[model samples]
Target: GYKEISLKYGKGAVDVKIDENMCTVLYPEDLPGVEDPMAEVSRSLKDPIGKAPLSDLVKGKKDVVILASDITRPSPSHILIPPITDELNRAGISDDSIKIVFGLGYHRKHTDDEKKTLVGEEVFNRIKCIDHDIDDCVYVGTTKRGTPVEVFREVYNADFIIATGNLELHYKAGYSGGHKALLPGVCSKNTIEKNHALMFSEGAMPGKIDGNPMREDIEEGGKLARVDFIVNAVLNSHKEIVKVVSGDPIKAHREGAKYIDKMYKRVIPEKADIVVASCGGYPKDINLYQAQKGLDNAQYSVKDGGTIILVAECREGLGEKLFSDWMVNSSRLGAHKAAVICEVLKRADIYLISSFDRSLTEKIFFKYAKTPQDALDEAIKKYHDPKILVLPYANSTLPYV
Candidate 1:
């Protein structure tokens, strides 16, 4: 028997048919999404957790600043922003008083066209949308864990702050939504580095939150900044909002994280001989920096001395300067990718299929291939008739043995 699977790659997809008599294919359960995502957003704002209704909460606030996810993350900002501003406007906060800050974190700035495209035309024209300038931050205070709580000046000074993002399985800091929009999202580089310095500490693994030091540090930082409200989404593999969590930054996000565990988390009975993983396409695979999430998740399902074929289309190439430096020259302290990848390489060989430069891929410890089939053909040569496993959405699919 043959099994055929089409994996996500950049804007499109790639087809790979394996001849294994019984190949394994793992995908997260496809939970049905809201009939209308905007209604869900409004509903969440009205019946929020850990806080009063948004309209009531903003009763007498001077101004509001919304910290939104940047271009890199697949946050459905367009759906969330309009409804949020409605609640703000209904609460007597005028359109001019609301500012939307793209939480750039250590990411790059967006083009005017990119900004318009991200939040849609209506909201783009209504409010002043700006970038988070790392240099323009004000030191709020220090977290209980000692991470400096320096956030964007406007966000730090806002009478009310609303954080918005999509919830997902983050490699570290447990999950990617909630107060994450503050600590690393709109903060200074020093603040980001100081908070991210705990990335590898114990309990920082994916799917862990309650005892996660990194997450706790972020919650602490958000408290110092006085995050008044939040709206986070839990998406299906297609990036549609399956669930929305709003209200208190900590409690709402914790509730959102629970939905992520129910839907995206996966488990396998045992390890496979050769694992084929895809980054789930587009923005997640927009650049090498983001695509690493799939690789990180795929590592757990592979056996020692096995092979892993990574399928991603890095149209934007090797992301940040520091990211490129660490990837190309990993021998030194420049090994920021040092811990995660090195640990996996010790067990298995890696092959890659992407739009990334072949030469650069080779330089960065990846065996370059034109396609997954090409990668698989070579991998099969190394391990004759290897037991195969496929993860079509590795970025969202958290696998465990």
Candidate 2:
């Protein structure tokens, strides 16, 4: 018997066939999404965890800055900004008193169209919306781990700072959201580099939180930034908000992380010889840098010497010039581009099914496949009669056993 699966592929879908007898398909258990997201956002603001309502916090605050995720993230900032602005207005704060700072980190600045799409036209037009410039940041302090705490001057000078983003399992730093919106989000390139350098440390993998040094450092950075509040969402497989946590950045984010684990974490009985996964399409797979998260999560379900078939429509190419340069320059210098896929390469082989240039991928030591069927055919040839696992939304799902 054979089974067919359709995986998300860059604003579309791709279908692949596998022998059912040899395939074990893993999916996150069904989790409920918010029935009324706007109302839920308001409720979270009204009765926040470990802190006062946003309205109460904004009272008598002359300047406010909302740190939002950039284009690389799939957070629906447009849906979140309205209710937050309404709360500020209800507290007698004028429109000019509020600003939305896109936490670009080391990512590229969004175009006008992208910015409008990210924050919604109404919010973009009514309030000051600017990308965080690393060069324009002011020094705050430093983490114990030695990561500098330099952030956008707008965010540094704000009388009240609120961080907003979706809480999800991150490849590094354990999970995204919370103080991340400040450190890597609105922070300087030097600060981001120092913090991210710790990704090689133990306990920095996906779904890990406790004792994660990188995460702990980010929390310290957030404290140094004096972030007053947080409003973060936990998204389901469909990217709908399943839960919202607000107030006290660390406490609120911890609650949201637990909710995410309950939904996206799955226990696999055993590892597979071949793992098929996707980055969940569109924005998630828009670039190789972002799509790498899917590969990282999929590794958890594969065994040593196994093969991983990553299905991502990386239409935006490598996503980061520095990463691309590293791959290219390393190959030119006769050095391995091994560190990029260091974790997976240690245990298994990776075959990428993406829209990126095959020549470029080959330079980075990634085997390129034109389609999922092609990848499967190659995997079958490499591992005669192998056991397989299929993870359609691998970017968000974490498997453990």
Candidate 3:
């Protein structure tokens, strides 16, 4: 039977009341109090470290390229477009001169409908928007560190480049937005791939700002591409831009990262013998492919040799074929860890508790549990004396929890 889960938005404490008929999950309104956090954050950018107003940043700057963030759950829509557009207009930068880069990185290009859903009609229609292609793009030059800075011809040719995005916790990059929006979003594919590979290692620094390898790597890429200005926003819980930092990419971004660190970073959980969670929100969990995010987050939180139980009601089967193909063709862990099987097996035990898709668990290589309780029972049978705890809402809190 499904149990209803409830929690106050900002409060970490979750309240779950058991009702046999059906669970009535009451989620806390952890939403931040920002009536117009986006607009306010945009307005904050009006005056930053630079001597001139935001209008001055784009004033008379023709072919101004506006690099906006791609689709993500906590993307800062309220702060990014409106105020920057208003300032650009005041600075006399023509609407046609402005453009947005989707910053897809290695991911697929934004479909027509996806673009409309993410960017909205007015901005999408008014500005020239384009997606990034990893395979094809021009190389600007290599940094002193030897990493190449390949950028799109369009972005390089532009007289001035401006980036817009929100600051949030990133799995590999430590934090998102700031200088990062440019290198991976607007820069060439090679530059992004190189940076992305580093995520497997440097991505672990959560809520860090200064001397962060991920941010530094992105800054180096941005500098090589000759990014002129950046308009980075930090949002509150409700996805409102509560803070904005503008001007010299490095200095302003450094300052911006501090605020983000203050707001988002929390004490990491020491260890958990058993961990469970969901990806974040729905549609993200509409299928197993997206639901695996919960698995990924759980993998890090649980102790080595511990069991991780995932609770995702994946109405859809595996979301992406590549994921399924990867599961079948790839070994128990992943291609990256194939050589280290002994080390990999020593890690956490994985169990998926979902009635939606049985094919995902039909094979014996991966263990399958019918229900959350059943998964716990299997674990108890295997490790009778091991500690056990439940993470009812697994996705949202696991990564940071």
Give the per-residue lDDT of model 3 (tens digit) for 294-313: 45545555677787666665
lDDT of 2 by residue, 1-401 (tens): 98999989999999989999999877775477878998889988888998888777778888999988888887889978889999999999899999999999878889988999989999999998989998999999988899999989999889999899988877667788899888888988889889877877857778787788889899999999999999998887778888788999988998998888887887778898999998888999988777877877888778999999899988988666655556555431111123546657767888888876688767666788889999898778888778898999887778765
lDDT of 1 by residue, 284-372 (tens): 88877777778888887898998889898889887666666677774522245545676787789888788877887787788888989
What is the Cα-based TM-score of model 3? 0.70
Please estimate how well model 2 matches the true structure, expressed as its whole-model Cα lDDT.
0.84
Residue 33 lDDT, candidate 1, scale 0-100: 84
| Model 2, total clashes | 0
* Per-candidate local distance difference test: 0.84, 0.84, 0.60
Off by over 4 Å in 1: 1-25, 31-35, 72-74, 107-115, 200-203, 268-293, 303-339, 349-392
Local error of candidate 3 at 26, Å? 16
Question: Model 2 residue 222 lDDT?
Answer: 92
